[PDB]
Design a protein around this motif. Structure first.
Motif, PDB file in Angstrom:
ATOM      1  N   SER A  80      58.018  73.123  34.375  1.00  0.00           N
ATOM      2  CA  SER A  80      56.818  72.637  35.033  1.00  0.00           C
ATOM      3  C   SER A  80      56.246  71.497  34.200  1.00  0.00           C
ATOM      4  CB  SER A  80      55.780  73.770  35.197  1.00  0.00           C
ATOM      5  OG  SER A  80      54.490  73.290  35.562  1.00  0.00           O
ATOM      6  N   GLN A  82      52.558  70.282  33.350  1.00  0.00           N
ATOM      7  CA  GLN A  82      51.107  70.416  33.342  1.00  0.00           C
ATOM      8  C   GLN A  82      50.527  69.265  32.527  1.00  0.00           C
ATOM      9  OE1 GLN A  82      49.549  74.121  31.864  1.00  0.00           O
ATOM     10  NE2 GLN A  82      47.420  73.515  32.295  1.00  0.00           N
ATOM     11  N   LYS A  87      56.138  72.771  30.417  1.00  0.00           N
ATOM     12  CA  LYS A  87      56.162  74.230  30.268  1.00  0.00           C
ATOM     13  C   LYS A  87      57.570  74.740  30.615  1.00  0.00           C
ATOM     14  CE  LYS A  87      52.264  75.411  32.577  1.00  0.00           C
ATOM     15  NZ  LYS A  87      51.032  76.176  32.911  1.00  0.00           N
ATOM     16  N   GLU A 177      46.884  72.415  27.196  1.00  0.00           N
ATOM     17  CA  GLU A 177      47.043  72.253  28.632  1.00  0.00           C
ATOM     18  C   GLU A 177      47.482  70.847  29.009  1.00  0.00           C
ATOM     19  OE1 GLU A 177      44.717  75.364  30.832  1.00  0.00           O
ATOM     20  OE2 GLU A 177      43.068  74.066  30.133  1.00  0.00           O
TER      21      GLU A 177
END
Ligand code: ZN
Ligand code: ZN
Ligand code: ZN
Ligand code: ZN
Lengths: 299, 299
Positions: A80, A82, A87, A177
């Motif tokens: 992923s 982000q 990730k 994040e």
């Protein structure tokens, strides 16, 4: 005595892995069944001039990502993007995963960096999030992915991941994040840090440390007001002092018997007269990378 | 960038234990079936004025020593006094024992300290064995027993254990066989450190770091000779420079294209003219706690 002190780095050493994707190899952070690393691991050197990351990431599948812990491969089974972090979901949870949280820290706060090279920890040092959201660090090539953290005795607060050296030679990265601290983007273009200012409340905490440790020559017979103290702060590119800052300095005030404004007055005369060749705590300049909390733990 | 950097402290965190004997509690180093700690754990506060350690240690048996790892007790089954350290033989070997060696380091060399409080690691920082065999550290009460170490990637070289703050506020301790660095004894009496001198070869390594990192204003159009460079060293309490020191600086010389003596000449003019309010690598004074090896690993 008084030194710049990093947290113990064991709980983080067991989380560092090496991530490869093409010839580009950087560090990753393995917590539970997820490895976190900067997304520009998917970039060639040419790519970095103007990367379209979604497009670059489409040409990549799970089996393109080489995640290694020491001499063990971890099978990637999901990827992923982000913000500016990748990730990499893997099959095995990290057995050494401490209790951790991801926190975005505030400009002026300090954290420890575990500087790594190809998944191996090489050193640890304390640093501060400069007001202009850069950090003055120590990041060789392949140190990308190194993380900054604080430890509040039980869990590791991860607050930083290194992404970039800027053309100023200063350092920029994201929270865990993927959001940059500051106006920076993970692209190899010209990027201004903007004017950096001294962390006033920190400098005052240092003087308090100095007083506690026997260095008190800079103490004055004057005092001052907050607004007029701040009128000299702006002149010398110092963050303005607030009542909060005065409150945080409270315990140090209550220990030294030295009222905050009285300290602000001695700081004033050091700023307008310099330090005359003398040192405070063995520094010939005013030190701003200790929070009041940092000083308190050492006293 | 360039920062004072400690080694990763994980391999040492798993070795720290708490040792109690009476009301006195300090840190210990658990390796294989032995815990090492400073012998003055057997001392009351009165004892420290003039301790006869053999005599004090006779009144103590195994069951007087409370060795704790986190929340686990280790049964002491044999106690020895080796110079100024107590060797508490216990029943269970430390499972986390890394490969380690005990080395006595040389004045001018650097090591990392894992500062601890009642067997708990609180922080890590880099420091140097000052020429006068003291260290400028950060040691609160109950930090006794904290160890200094280097890591040469596979094994931990333990080189220091903290025993004492001296009346100067500076720090003294032993190697891990119990021999003090310097003329100090583990007794609460007046003790002189003697004149401390700057670690010249280290300062030069720092300037080389500075050149590598873009700060090169201090570079001169002069040069100099070694004996005349040393004629200014003695004046400014600097260790005399030897050919060995010149050789160690070799790789930094071969990288910067700057001959060692040319650097010695720029150092000369900084010592006789000061630094005019400017900074090198963000320091307003000459930094001597980086060995040439320390600088090399960061470049
Ligand atoms: Zn990178
Ligand atoms: Zn917590
Ligand atoms: Zn002690
Ligand atoms: Zn070794």
């Amino acid at each position: 005595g008084f030194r710049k002190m990093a947290f113990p780095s064991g709980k983080v050493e067991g989380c560092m892995v090496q991530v490869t994707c093409g010839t580009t190899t950087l560090n990753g952070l393995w917590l539970d069944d997820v490895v976190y690393c900067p997304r520009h691991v998917i970039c060639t050197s040419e790519d970095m001039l103007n990367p379209n990351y979604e497009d670059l990431l489409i040409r990549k599948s799970n089996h393109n990502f080489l995640v290694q812990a020491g001499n063990v491969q971890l099978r990637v089974i999901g990827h992923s993007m982000q913000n500016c972090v990748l990730k990499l979901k893997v099959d095995t949870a990290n057995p050494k995963t401490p209790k951790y949280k991801f926190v975005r820290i505030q400009p002026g706060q300090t954290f420890s960096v575990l500087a790594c090279y190809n998944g191996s920890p090489s050193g640890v040092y304390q640093c501060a999030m400069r007001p202009n959201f850069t950090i003055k660090g120590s990041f060789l090539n392949g140190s990308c992915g190194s993380v900054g953290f604080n430890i509040d005795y039980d869990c590791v607060s991860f607050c930083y991941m290194h992404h970039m050296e800027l053309p100023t030679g200063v350092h920029a990265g994201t929270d865990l994040e993927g959001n940059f601290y500051g106006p920076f983007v993970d692209r190899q273009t010209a990027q201004a840090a903007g004017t950096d200012t001294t962390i006033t409340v920190n400098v005052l905490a240092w003087l308090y440390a100095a007083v506690i440790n026997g260095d008190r020559w800079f103490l004055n017979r004057f005092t001052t007001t907050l607004n007029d103290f701040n009128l000299v702060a702006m002149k010398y590119n110092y963050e303005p002092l607030t009542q909060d800052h005065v409150d945080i300095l409270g315990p140090l005030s209550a220990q030294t018997g030295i009222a905050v404004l009285d300290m602000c007055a001695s700081l004033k005369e050091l700023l307008q007269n310099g330090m005359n060749g003398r040192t405070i705590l063995g520094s010939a300049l005013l030190e701003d990378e200790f929070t009041p909390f940092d000083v308190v733990r050492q006293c």
